[PDB]
Design a protein around this nucleic acid. Structure first.
Lengths: 54, 117, 109, 142, 103
RNA sequence: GGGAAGCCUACCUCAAGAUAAGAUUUCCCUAGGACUUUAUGUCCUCUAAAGAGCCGUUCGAGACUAGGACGUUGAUAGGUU
RNA sequence: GCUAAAACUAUGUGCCGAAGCUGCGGAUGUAUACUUUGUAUACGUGGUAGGGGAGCGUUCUGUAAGCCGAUGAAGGUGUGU
RNA sequence: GUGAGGGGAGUGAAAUAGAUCCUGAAACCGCAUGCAUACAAGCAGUGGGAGCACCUUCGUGGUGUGACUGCGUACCUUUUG
């Protein structure tokens, strides 16, 4: 099964009208004060005022 | 004497594409599709130059009918009365007066009805 | 006045890079950098490279402060493609297109 | 370009009220359609709505002649297989009088967006009262 | 005040100071033209309807110039019959300016 | 007037995108400037309410969704007894 | 949608209605006269297969050791006529 | 990233002549501005036609858009069609 007519650019863009991306949830940490992904350990090993690597 | 076709062919295709401005999709981009669209537009225009006169005469007749029925006659009786009273004003002017000046149209209706009587 | 950076010949499809471009179009540079830093898309790395290059150009060649910059203009164009051959079943061959793209970023205040 | 079209911003719609007691359905619907479309005004334009608002009261007293009370049929089709439904004039007039007038005038109006707009100016009420006293309708004997 | 005149097989309703285009005339530019066959004169409430024509009425106009309307393409095509032809057209006209109306 | 497993109701489910978009109870928001295109007009400063969502622990709900419960004023899941 | 019709039969007075006919403006073929003409009148001007007539553009040779050109050629892209 | 690629500086008559580099058309793919578009059925135009935006010799002007409306079943070939 294949198309009988080539699809127009208009209909192609209409189909793609649902492809937009979305933003993550970011938050400024307390103890250190940089941005991190919410509910995740910061890239330097801190989470809720505890250190993972001394 | 070898002849290259590029410049003349390009000019012809470009003129057709320029006459195709404003059409939807490939009808303003693709030469094969755009060429068919211009010929059909020409045919439609040729036929509609005749259709326009009919449409406008129908509009004038409708407005004259409304005015005559406001003044107590029908269109056919008003036309007959004016013809018997020898008035030769045409339907375009009669419709213009009907739409823009009610008193003059009432006077014309009185003339026609007097001729009918 | 706008300050421009171009990344040409990036090894990714324009259709894929345009999603990240649309994500960051119109925002302030700090917010856009946060988004690009915490995105998981491949095109995020390339767009971040281009944006940081644009910020560096604005700072060093025009003497502008970064606190007021925003992403005023961004778009992605198609690049030159590479052509390859993939063998199918029963001796048939198909043609493969490997696509690239150009990224343009302009910042201004 | 001396022949002018009416402008929608300058059209003026007047309100009228019509009693349907003892009238014949079709011979009333023709006049209602005329006045809804605006054929009675000298500014009539085919692509502009210039008509009036018509309120119809005492809708269930409308009449038909002959044996049409038992015999005239109203059909509709749900688009499921075998879904053709049928009723007649006596049941329909006792149940929903507004539908009879809506069908009769819908049949006589143009079939497009302008026709949909023109049918919205007809208000049909079963009893002798209407809620549009604020528009001060005039009595129309048609 | 307005009047009804006939020129070039058609009729026009005119007021003083109006410029209008009619079919091509033979009058030279700058000349004056008199219509002595007025069909109607209206002066607010004074209404004169000529039986064929109002007796004594006159409308005076002045010729501005001559010209041609915009180009029109004529296309004829019979499908599947190997036939096609085309031609252009521009219609001549004369411009007039009404200067006087007397009932 | 009577008159059938037939028609309309009656029984179950869905149903106001019924654009004619219906009804009821309760809750929220009442600040100052400048300008002309004197208008539900346009730009400043100050204000972010009732709520909804992102996120997390998840489900007798689930393709993805949607829907249900909870988020320290806590038994939502795991563990422990 | 229509029932002393918006049906049928008979008669009448009006009107609508085509690229038909008339009005106004313009073009063209043939013929007859002006006894060069490009001016009149008359009759014409839907067309497949076909037949006849008249033209537009393109490359190259002569005219050209001429004429236009860095005060901007060809080519590309708009606008006006 | 001692990468690719770019932004300055410099050379040049010219760097949108910057190395697969004279000119750089079309299909095809982006970004920005103006207008229209989420109650309405079909070769997508054509004859009308309101409103809006910009320009303006301020109009019976120009440019872009086209709510609503009459008519309207592509092209070629082969065929009695």
């Amino acid at each position: 099964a294949v198309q009988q007519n080539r699809k127009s650019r208009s209909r192609r863009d209409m189909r793609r009208s649902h492809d937009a991306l979305t933003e993550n949830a970011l938050t400024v940490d307390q103890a250190t004060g940089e941005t991190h992904r919410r509910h995740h350990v910061t890239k330097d090993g801190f989470y809720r005022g505890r250190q993972l690597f001394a | 004497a070898r002849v290259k076709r590029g410049v003349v062919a390009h000019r012809r295709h470009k003129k057709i594409l320029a006459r195709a401005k404003g059409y939807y999709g490939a009808r303003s981009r693709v030469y094969r599709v755009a060429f068919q669209a211009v010929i059909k537009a020409g045919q439609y225009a040729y036929r509609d130059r005749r259709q326009k006169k009919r449409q406008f005469r129908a509009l004038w007749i409708a407005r004259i009918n409304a005015g005559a029925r406001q003044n107590g006659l029908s269109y056919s009786r008003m036309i007959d009365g004016l013809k018997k009273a020898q008035v030769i004003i045409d339907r375009r002017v009669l419709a213009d007066i009907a739409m823009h000046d009610a008193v003059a149209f009432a006077a014309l209706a009185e003339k026609a009805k007097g001729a009918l009587a | 006045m706008e300050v421009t950076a171009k990344l040409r010949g990036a090894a990714i499809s324009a259709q894929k890079a345009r999603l990240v471009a649309d994500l960051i179009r119109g925002k302030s540079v700090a917010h856009a950098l946060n988004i690009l830093n915490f995105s998981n898309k491949k095109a995020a790395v390339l767009v971040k490279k281009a944006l940081e290059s644009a910020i560096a150009n604005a700072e060093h060649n025009n003497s502008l402060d970064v606190d007021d910059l925003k992403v005023s203009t961004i778009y992605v164009d198609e690049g030159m493609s590479l052509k390859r051959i993939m063998p199918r079943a029963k001796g048939r061959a198909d043609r493969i297109t490997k696509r690239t793209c150009h990224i343009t970023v302009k910042v201004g205040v | 370009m001396k022949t002018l079209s009416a402008k929608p911003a300058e059209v003026q719609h007047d309100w009228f009220v019509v009693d349907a007691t003892g009238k014949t359905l079709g011979r009333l619907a023709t006049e209602i359609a005329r006045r809804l479309r605006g054929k009675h005004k000298t500014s009539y334009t085919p692509h502009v709505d210039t008509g009036d608002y018509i309120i119809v009261i005492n809708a269930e007293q409308v009449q038909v002649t002959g044996n049409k009370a038992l015999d005239k049929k109203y059909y509709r089709h749900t688009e499921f297989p075998g879904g053709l439904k049928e009723t007649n004039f006596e049941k329909l007039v006792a149940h929903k009088p507004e539908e009879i007038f809506e069908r009769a005038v819908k049949g006589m109006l143009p079939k497009g967006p302008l026709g949909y707009a023109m049918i919205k100016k007809m208000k049909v009420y079963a009893g002798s009262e209407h809620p549009h006293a604020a528009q001060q309708p005039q009595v129309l004997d048609i | 005040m307005y009047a009804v005149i006939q020129s070039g097989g058609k009729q026009h309703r005119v007021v003083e100071g109006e410029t209008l285009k009619v079919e091509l005339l033979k009058a030279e530019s700058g000349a004056t033209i008199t219509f002595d066959d007025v069909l109607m004169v209206v002066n607010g409430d004074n209404i004169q309807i000529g039986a064929p024509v109002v007796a004594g009425a006159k409308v005076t106009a002045e010729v501005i110039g001559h010209g041609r309307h915009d180009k029109i393409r004529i296309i004829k095509m019979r499908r599947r019959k190997h036939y096609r032809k085309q031609q252009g057209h521009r219609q001549w006209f004369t411009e007039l300016k009404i200067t006087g109306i007397s009932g």
